[PDB]
């Protein structure tokens, strides 16, 4: 009866993010010191199977992609995790046509989902962004993407 756990991810799966009261960060070291939108009480949803959970309630040491652990960039002493995507992560202001565009909007390089984890009950959902086109925060933001391949 239980479906696939959200800790399991496969390439081509559709991810659905919600970032309540999301704010703006000038630079995220997980994205090579580039602007990002981050929320404290964010929620992640897998569209294909319908599984969803709050980002702060996920033990990111256990999550797997295609049977492999996520690539972790320990930047400035903070451990992040990578959920890659095929294409750019599409995000917009919640409930409205207000829509956002990522930092690498001009290139063919794909985007990724980054989450900072303390190991307890505090996780921050980071989505790539170019500027405050949806606002400097706290602003509700909703996102969507399709999971990509394992890092090489």
């Amino acid at each position: 009866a239980p479906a696939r756990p959200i800790t399991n991810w496969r390439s081509g799966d559709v991810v659905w993010v919600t970032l309540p009261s999301a704010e703006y960060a000038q630079s995220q070291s997980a994205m090579g010191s580039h602007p990002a939108y981050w929320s404290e009480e964010a929620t992640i949803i897998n569209v294909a199977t319908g599984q969803r959970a709050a980002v702060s309630s996920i033990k990111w040491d256990q999550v797997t992609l295609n049977g492999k652990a996520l690539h972790k960039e320990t930047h400035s002493g903070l451990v992040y995790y990578q959920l890659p995507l095929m294409g750019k992560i599409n995000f917009w202001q919640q409930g409205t046509t207000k829509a956002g565009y990522t930092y690498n909007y001009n290139t063919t390089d794909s985007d990724s989902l980054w989450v900072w984890w303390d190991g307890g009950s505090k996780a921050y959902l980071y989505i790539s962004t170019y500027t405050t086109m949806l606002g400097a925060g706290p602003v509700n933001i909703t996102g969507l993407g399709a999971v990509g391949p394992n890092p090489v």
Epitope: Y24, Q26, S27, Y130, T131, T132, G135, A136, G137
Partner: antibody, heavy 124, light 110 residues
């Protein structure tokens, strides 16, 4: 107690330079962009300067360009506002405040907390 | 003389409504976001409206703001003697590459 205090006020001879040190406590300096803002007596607010999170970007105002200089020392968690050749128009209570907004074409400013201000009283 | 223009002053009876206009070109208020600031005398100015439509935590619900085209307007419901201060706009000028604040409006009660 999150605070962002300013020091370096007092009566100043005209045509001289000061360093408006800005000590920051209670928050991470490198996650914020610190603004500088002055209010002349009997007048309103006027934005002065701006520095990025890592000190890479330094932004000035049209009326303060050339005479003003912004600097950042993230090791000491203190942003430095170097005034130069103070005039009769900048005898103002220099507030300082932190911002977590952006600067690109659709910029949104969040100048969250403003300090109590330092009073430059350039006169005889 | 600021890019963002405001009425010099405004007044109303206690408990009433006031509104402060704030104009500008597309480079600052048409493209970028705007914010409002209250400067009670003797203390540091506060943030009451951000993102042209939202307020920080702790700001009373009686304050409101909304942008109509290349212009924004402050809205204060239920005027009080305590809420007598100077209100300023705040936004980024992409063309000028600088932060432009509002000219200044003074709330009074009589």
């Amino acid at each position: 107690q999150v605070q962002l205090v300013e020091s370096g006020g007092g009566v100043v001879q005209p045509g001289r330079s000061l360093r408006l040190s800005c000590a920051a406590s209670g928050f991470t300096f490198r996650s914020y962009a610190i603004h500088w803002v002055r209010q002349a007596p009997g007048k309103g607010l006027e934005w002065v300067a701006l520095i990025s999170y890592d000190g890479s970007n330094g932004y000035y105002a049209d009326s303060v360009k050339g005479r003003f200089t912004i600097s950042r020392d993230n090791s000491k968690n203190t942003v430095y506002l170097q005034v130069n050749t103070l005039r009769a128009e900048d005898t103002a209570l220099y507030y300082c405040a932190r911002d977590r907004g952006s600067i690109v074409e659709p910029a949104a400013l969040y100048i969250d907390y403003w300090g109590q201000g330092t009073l430059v009283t350039v006169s005889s | 003389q600021s890019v963002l223009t405001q009425p010099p002053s405004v007044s109303a009876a206690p408990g009433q409504m006031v509104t402060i206009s704030c104009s500008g070109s597309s480079s600052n208020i048409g493209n970028n976001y705007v914010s409002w600031y209250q400067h009670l005398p003797g203390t540091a100015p506060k943030l009451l409206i951000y993102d042209n439509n939202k307020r920080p935590s702790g700001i009373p619900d009686r304050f409101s703001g909304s942008k109509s085209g290349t212009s924004v307007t402050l809205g204060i419901t239920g005027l009080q003697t305590g809420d007598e201060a100077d209100y300023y706009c705040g936004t980024w000028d992409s063309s000028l590459s600088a932060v432009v604040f509002g000219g200044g409006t003074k709330l009074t009660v009589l």
